[PDB]
Amino acid sequence: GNKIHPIGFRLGITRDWESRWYAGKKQYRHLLLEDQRIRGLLEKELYSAGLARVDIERAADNVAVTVHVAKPGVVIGRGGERIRVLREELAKLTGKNVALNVQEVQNPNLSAPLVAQRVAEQIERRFAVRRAIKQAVQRVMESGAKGAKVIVSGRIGGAEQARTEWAAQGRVPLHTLRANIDYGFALARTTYGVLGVKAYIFLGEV
Amino acid sequence: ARKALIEKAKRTPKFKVRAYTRCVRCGRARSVYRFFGLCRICLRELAHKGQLPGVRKASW
Amino acid sequence: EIMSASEGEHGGYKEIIAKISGDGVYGRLKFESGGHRVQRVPATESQGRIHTSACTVAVMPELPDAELPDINPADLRIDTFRSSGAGGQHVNTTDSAIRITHLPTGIVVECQDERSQHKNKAKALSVLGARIHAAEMAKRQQAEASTRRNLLGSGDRNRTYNFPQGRVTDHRINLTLYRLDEVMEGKLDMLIEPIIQEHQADQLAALSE
RNA sequence: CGCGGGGUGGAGCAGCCUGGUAGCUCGUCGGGCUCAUAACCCGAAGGUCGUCGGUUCAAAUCCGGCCCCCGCAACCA
RNA sequence: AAAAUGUAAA
RNA sequence: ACGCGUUAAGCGCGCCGCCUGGGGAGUACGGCCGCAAGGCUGAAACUCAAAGGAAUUGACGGGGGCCCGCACAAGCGGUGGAGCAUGUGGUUUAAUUCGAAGCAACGCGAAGAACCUUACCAGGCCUUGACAUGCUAGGGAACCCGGGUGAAAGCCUGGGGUGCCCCGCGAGGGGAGCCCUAGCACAGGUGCUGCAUGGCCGUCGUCAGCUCGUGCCGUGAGGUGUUGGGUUAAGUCCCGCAACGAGCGCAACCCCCGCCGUUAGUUGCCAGCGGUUCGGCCGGGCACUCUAACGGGACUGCCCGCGAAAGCGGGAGGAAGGAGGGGACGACGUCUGGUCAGCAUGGCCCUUACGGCCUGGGCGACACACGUGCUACAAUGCCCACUACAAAGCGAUGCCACCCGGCAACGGGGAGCUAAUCGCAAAAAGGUGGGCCCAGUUCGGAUUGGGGUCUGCAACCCGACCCCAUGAAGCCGGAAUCGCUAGUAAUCGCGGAUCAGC
Ligand SMILES: [Mg+2]
Ligand SMILES: [Mg+2]
Ligand SMILES: [Mg+2]
Ligand SMILES: [Mg+2]
Ligand SMILES: [Mg+2]
Ligand SMILES: [Mg+2]
Ligand SMILES: [Mg+2]
Ligand SMILES: [Mg+2]
Ligand SMILES: [Mg+2]
Ligand SMILES: [Mg+2]
Ligand SMILES: [Mg+2]
Ligand SMILES: [Mg+2]
Ligand SMILES: [Mg+2]
Ligand SMILES: [Mg+2]
Ligand SMILES: [Mg+2]
Ligand SMILES: [Mg+2]
Ligand SMILES: [Mg+2]
Ligand SMILES: [Mg+2]
Ligand SMILES: [Mg+2]
Ligand SMILES: [Mg+2]
Ligand SMILES: [Mg+2]
Ligand SMILES: [Mg+2]
Ligand SMILES: [Mg+2]
Ligand SMILES: [Mg+2]
Ligand SMILES: [Mg+2]
Ligand SMILES: [Mg+2]
Ligand SMILES: [Mg+2]
Ligand SMILES: [Mg+2]
Ligand SMILES: [Mg+2]
Ligand SMILES: [Mg+2]
Ligand SMILES: [Mg+2]
Ligand SMILES: [Mg+2]
Ligand SMILES: [Mg+2]
Ligand SMILES: [Mg+2]
Ligand SMILES: [Mg+2]
Ligand SMILES: [Mg+2]
Ligand SMILES: [Mg+2]
Ligand SMILES: [Mg+2]
Ligand SMILES: [Mg+2]
Ligand SMILES: [Mg+2]
Ligand SMILES: [Mg+2]
Ligand SMILES: [Mg+2]
Ligand SMILES: [Mg+2]
Ligand SMILES: [Mg+2]
Ligand SMILES: [Mg+2]
Ligand SMILES: [Mg+2]
Ligand SMILES: [Mg+2]
Ligand SMILES: [Mg+2]
Ligand SMILES: [Mg+2]
Ligand SMILES: [Mg+2]
Ligand SMILES: [Mg+2]
Ligand SMILES: [Mg+2]
Ligand SMILES: [Mg+2]
Ligand SMILES: [Mg+2]
């Protein structure tokens, strides 16, 4: 075990912070604390919409959270309802301020943290792991990507003996900084235990 | 010593120095960076995600 | 205090005997006699495989011993008669030869070595002693080795020590407790006491049932 | 019993003739080498010399008794 | 020329 | 299959000899032969699920060729010896919590064990529980107060308020609700399994490797490509080639250091002027120094010689020349590696107890063994006083200038700074001056006595520092063994994370 987190490796180089705000010293900690609370309680409820990324930026008490999706019909709710009560549970826990603006990424198949979850779900639903992997990469490759690769690990198909498993089309130069590459994890829970899906999507150069 | 232990450090104790740090995410007692209230592991995790603003891998 | 103790290269003791002296010793070590299985990855492991092994142990109580206060004329039958072979007229008119019969066992020694009857009785009485001794030595061997064959035999009895499970499990009373560490340390009581108790529950349904 | 030799660190063997002085090999213990073991390398421990006595300023050494071990002898009838 | 060995469970 | 191939192992015929799983066994018995040794003929019981032929791919070699690494060598300083610091084995213990085990465990998880931390021990306790969402019987209100007892938890109790939905006139009711007593749901576990797992980490290894597609060869495993000549830190490139391509690696894209430029001019800086509270201090001003943001700069570009090329060797100009120095980056995989004790998680197990609380013990124990360490044995040294020259960080619950007392640890008093402003802050080696004279020493500072400062509820176990006295082992360390090739080794300080404190 030895590979580096692609994201942490490309900070301010090809990938921007999921949270953007200054602090100082005497306040940074509890700032991030509630900040982390947000993204987590967001993920728990907005899972149904399958979020690809939650952005958070702050101001003098003013706090903005620009959440992403590829199917926002769930976030927006009936006519425009669920989005309000959402923010109306937000300041119910921030004790500060509110924010909406839920923009939507075009191709969901070109978002890795999105992909993994849709795959990791197929796992829980007892699907062919070898097949779903090649299916995933196919759907990613045939939808414009310049590379792809998906890795799972754990008791594949409830095997007494756990093992690694993956496939890849195109190219995925994880060593190259100049390459913009998306990545995300998904935790495949099941009766036999916890698998784990990691998705690598190489979008292109820069 | 999981959910139970972490509780004591949250509430202010009998004496002054009796109060102690603990990760504000995993609840690890030992090695807690006070700047975040986080442990060295939780620190590395979220810093990798980008959830820790302005913090990038150092190199020189 | 150990007596015999052949080593074992690494580690052991391939065999070791020890006199554990005191009070209530045989009472709490009675049930050890038997085979003790061990399952773990041994020290000697060339790779990473768990290996089953075994060791028979035998507790024997203190045996008050006593050799017979040498012979006894009352149970000796001694015969004198004329020796055989050369000697001239002396050998012809001198019951110099000897024969002693040790009535209890049945072993007999003759002796017509030297010219004095007395000296021949001396030799015969000496060999007679030596021959009873080695008789009782053979007897105490066909008892000692045989009671070991008595206890230790074709039977997969007594406790099993599993390290990776961390659980000792005495097979006889089907008790098992996953606190092997403490056991392997010395506190054997919550293992020998449950046997001592179950054994007593047997003695209840003994002559009463 | 008649003569001779013998008993010294766990094993085997010097030292006794000539009093002052415990030595050799092996073993054991501690530290190296090696993945580990042995070999090898470095350092240490370990007996008051069978046993009672006597001689002496002083006894493993000399002298006497006993115990144990070993070989020799035990013939003429 | 140096230089023996590696029990038995995947 | 290897190979045989008019010297068949090809295609056919004639005839002889012989085989029918391995071991038993070319043994036994019988017969025949022999001087013998032994030969010829030649079985069975029993036993195993194989024995065996050729090929393939690796691995290994006390096999080979070519290369490479602080591996040897050439070096300089050390460990191993001493005293102490700490980790570990072991033993001890009511407990001395658990895990890590050759490299790749042993100043490792621990970047802060007096309580807490704490998972252990002892005792005193607690039961829908310290925690989460619920369903409720008495159906009570907040919230402060106090007594009681106690080592504290805990148990018990005196208060009192005269809180809020209801067109309630009304003594009385009617809901929400921190909440109080009893229930059922359920919580909880640092309990077990890294050999059920995720993630993340060490590792061979920054080693140059590993593979796919398709084509072709091969009955087939598989081979080819990836081999080969040259070249390189490199499966790096060039040429060649039944192979043609491609992916993950290598490289580069990023960071810091080296030179230069634009931009920027306070809180930083001062070259020339004025000033002149004896001096960036006043006015003054971005030139420099610096700060930090964008840039230029190097491409085997030029020259020489070799070379088919790739590129190798030398020269020039240049702050820097063939990867300039350093970091970030760790391929397919390997170690049944590590970690259920950071968290997560399947299964298993505990349920007035394997859960929870408190006080006090332990994690610091001590016949010994090991790792890593710090201080030393001194004269290239040590002590004392004066005087210098850093970089990178920390600091409105903190840093503490500055006075004041103290021999000092420090305590009063107090200015400034949320800081390129103020402060931690004296850098220490160094220079100069003075003493010491080869000695267990003015070396060494272990150990111990006595006396105090600080932090904390509280320093007995069990803290750090100051003063006095004590002044041990050690006079260069056996066998053995480690680091590092340039601003490196050795040596000299400083800062920080942790953190009341150490
Ligand atoms: Mg994302
Ligand atoms: Mg507990
Ligand atoms: Mg608190
Ligand atoms: Mg504390
Ligand atoms: Mg033996
Ligand atoms: Mg024997
Ligand atoms: Mg007669
Ligand atoms: Mg009879
Ligand atoms: Mg123990
Ligand atoms: Mg001897
Ligand atoms: Mg060896
Ligand atoms: Mg001794
Ligand atoms: Mg002795
Ligand atoms: Mg005497
Ligand atoms: Mg004497
Ligand atoms: Mg006499
Ligand atoms: Mg052998
Ligand atoms: Mg082995
Ligand atoms: Mg031919
Ligand atoms: Mg021929
Ligand atoms: Mg056969
Ligand atoms: Mg045959
Ligand atoms: Mg024959
Ligand atoms: Mg025959
Ligand atoms: Mg014959
Ligand atoms: Mg012969
Ligand atoms: Mg023959
Ligand atoms: Mg090479
Ligand atoms: Mg060398
Ligand atoms: Mg000390
Ligand atoms: Mg105990
Ligand atoms: Mg009270
Ligand atoms: Mg009241
Ligand atoms: Mg390299
Ligand atoms: Mg072939
Ligand atoms: Mg063919
Ligand atoms: Mg190949
Ligand atoms: Mg060739
Ligand atoms: Mg290549
Ligand atoms: Mg710098
Ligand atoms: Mg001037
Ligand atoms: Mg003037
Ligand atoms: Mg540039
Ligand atoms: Mg040059
Ligand atoms: Mg070159
Ligand atoms: Mg394997
Ligand atoms: Mg020191
Ligand atoms: Mg003063
Ligand atoms: Mg003063
Ligand atoms: Mg003050
Ligand atoms: Mg100000
Ligand atoms: Mg000087
Ligand atoms: Mg002291
Ligand atoms: Mg000297």
| Residue ranges covered by each domain of chain B | 1-60
Resolution reading in Å: 3.5
Structure tokens belonging to residue A81: 């309802």
Fold designation for B1-60: 30s Ribosomal Protein S14; Chain N (4.10.830)
Query: Which residue places its CA closest to the C1' of nucleotide F252?
Result: A176
Structure tokens belonging to residue C124: 């015969």
In angstroms, the CA B48 to CA A9 distance is 8
In angstroms, the CA B25 to CA C85 distance is 111
Structure tokens belonging to residue A146: 């310049």
B32 close to B22: Cβ distance less than 8 angstroms: yes
Cα B2 from chain centroid (whole Å): 14
Backbone break loci in chain C, preceding residues, C–N > 2.5 A: none
In angstroms, the CA B6 to CA C105 distance is 84
Non-local (6+) Cβ contacts of A75 within 8 A are A46, A49, A67, A69, A82, A83, A86, A102
Q: Which residue has the tokens 């001794």?
A: C133
Q: What are phi and psi of C37, to 5 degrees?
A: -80, 150
Please check if B21 is assigned to a binding site: no
Rg (CA), chain C: 28
Cβ-nearest to A11 among B34, B46, B50:
B50
In angstroms, the CA C35 to CA A99 distance is 73
Which amino acid, A127?
F
Q: Count of CB atoms within 10 A of residue B47's CB?
A: 20
Is the dihedral angle over the CA atoms C22, C26, C27, C33 positive or is it negative? positive
The single-letter DSSP state of residue A145 is -
> Most distant CA pair in chain A: distance in Å?
54
Is the dihedral angle over the CA atoms C115, C117, C122, C126 positive or is it negative? positive
A171 close to A141: Cβ distance less than 8 angstroms: no
Q: How far is A54 from chain B (nearest CA, A)?
A: 10
A114 close to A123: Cβ distance less than 8 angstroms: no
Non-local (6+) Cβ contacts of C198 within 8 A are C173
In angstroms, the CA A125 to CA A73 distance is 24
Q: Which residue has the tokens 């230790």?
A: C152
Q: Which long-range contacts (CB under 8 A, 24 or more apart) does A128-131 make?
A: A129/A156, A129/A157, A129/A165, A130/A165
- Select from C56, C31, C17, C59 the least CA-distant residue to C154: C56
Non-local (6+) Cβ contacts of A97 within 8 A are A61, A62, A63, A91
Structure tokens belonging to residue A187: 């935790």
- Give CATH for domain A107-206: 3.30.1140.32
- Select from A30, A35, A40 the least CA-distant residue to B36: A30
Non-local (6+) Cβ contacts of C166 within 8 A are C178, C179, C180, C181
Q: How far is A19 from chain B (nearest CA, A)?
A: 5
Residues of chain A positioned with their CB less than 8 A from the CB of B23: none
Q: Count of CB atoms within 10 A of residue A101's CB?
A: 10
- Which protein residues, judged by their CB atom, are less than 7 Å from any atom of strand D? C 9-10, 86-90, 113-115, 119
C169 close to C176: Cβ distance less than 8 angstroms: yes
Q: Does A43 touch chain B (CB under 8 A)?
A: no
Which amino acid, C76?
L
Q: Return the H-helix or E-strand segment holding C17.
A: strand C13-18
Rounded to a whole number of angstroms, the distance between the first and last alpha carbons of chain C is 42
Distance C59 CA to ligand 13 centre (A): 30
Q: What are the distances in angstroms from CA C186 to CA A62, A132, C148, C182?
A: 66, 55, 25, 7
Partners of A183 in the β-ladder: A200
Q: Return the H-helix or E-strand segment holding A129.
A: helix A129-141
Rounded to a whole number of angstroms, the distance between the first and last alpha carbons of chain A is 29
Write the burial class of residue A131 (CB in 10 Å: 0-12 exposed, 13-18 middle, 19+ buried).
Answer: exposed
Are B47 and A8 in contact (CB < 8 Å)?
yes
Distance A74 CA to ligand 32 centre (A): 58
Residues of chain B positioned with their CB less than 8 A from the CB of A33: 24, 37
Structure tokens belonging to residue A27: 């306040």
Q: Which residue has the tokens 């090649």?
A: A134
Are B50 and A8 in contact (CB < 8 Å)?
yes
In angstroms, the CA C98 to CA C110 distance is 5
> How was this model experimentally determined?
X-ray
Cα A143 from chain centroid (whole Å): 19
Which amino acid, A128?
A
Instruction: Give distance CA A129 / C1' D20 (Å).
Output: 95
Q: Count of CB atoms within 10 A of residue C30's CB?
A: 14
In angstroms, the CA C155 to CA C10 distance is 28
Q: How far is A79 from chain B (nearest CA, A)?
A: 32
- Select from A118, A99, A97, A5 the least CA-distant residue to A51: A118
In angstroms, the CA B48 to CA A135 distance is 29
Q: Does domain A16-106 have CATH number 3.30.300.20?
A: yes
The single-letter DSSP state of residue C72 is -
In angstroms, the CA C5 to CA C17 distance is 6
Non-local (6+) Cβ contacts of B38 within 8 A are A29, B23, B24, B25, B32, B46
A111 close to A183: Cβ distance less than 8 angstroms: no
The single-letter DSSP state of residue A205 is -
A120 close to A156: Cβ distance less than 8 angstroms: no
In angstroms, the CA A197 to CA A18 distance is 21
Which amino acid, A123?
I
3-state secondary structure of A184: strand
The single-letter DSSP state of residue A175 is T
Write the burial class of residue A106 (CB in 10 Å: 0-12 exposed, 13-18 middle, 19+ buried).
Answer: exposed
Structure tokens belonging to residue B3: 């959910």
Buried b / exposed e over C174-205, threshold 16 CB at 10 Å, is eeeeeebeebeeeebeebbeebeeeeeeeeee
B20 close to B9: Cβ distance less than 8 angstroms: yes
Structure tokens belonging to residue A52: 């690809």
Residues of chain A with CATH 3.30.1140.32: 107-206
In angstroms, the CA B17 to CA C58 distance is 59
Residue C97's region, left for phi above 0, alpha for psi from -120 to 50, else beta, is: beta
